């Protein structure tokens, strides 16, 4: 079970990143940084030809309220992404044709301060679409959930043999779990993007959710954003 049904106008920075590995379409979450750039998880896109990638935006349900789609991804920017461990699981998608932002259904998220860490015990709002290879239209609804940030060292012991980097935080809410398609999901406080959802398929039962800490990469993100 994921979060509750949510209108795109509540989380207008949320997008779906569509890829086509192995002749099959998959979706991950993403965040609008501007009309030119989208922030997502690296593992979804690192080995995918940019010209195959599609950004779906302004969507409350990927099927039933499809919003808009931008099939003009020109480049994928990575920051020392490590395949084996998924260290630095963050990526910027560049567009050659800009997103048609209306400031309503589609709006950029605000970037955090350098090295910003959401306080332990505070809430973060994750939004996204979950797994896309399902038959139920409701499975394709935009969902959001308020998760409580938990202790990082405590979160690392729960993940056991799975390496987690310095550039993450963890959050959890009882009875809520993210799906593999929730990788790249924007995670906010107010309209400030504090996390990008990570996903570890081999994680233990009951494990907290892990998020790449946007504050750790905001210098690198700003460098890419200023390109256009």
TrEMBL record:
Transmembrane segments: none
Disulfide-bond pairs as recorded: 28-44, 155-170
GO biological process, one term: proteolysis
Superkingdom, natural source: Eukaryota
Pfam families to which the protein is assigned, alphabetical: Trypsin
PANTHER family the record matches: AT26814P-RELATED (PTHR24276:SF91), POLYSERASE-RELATED (PTHR24276)
Protein name: Group 3 allergen SMIPP-S Yv6023A04
Lineage, opening ranks: Eukaryota, Metazoa, Ecdysozoa, Arthropoda, Chelicerata
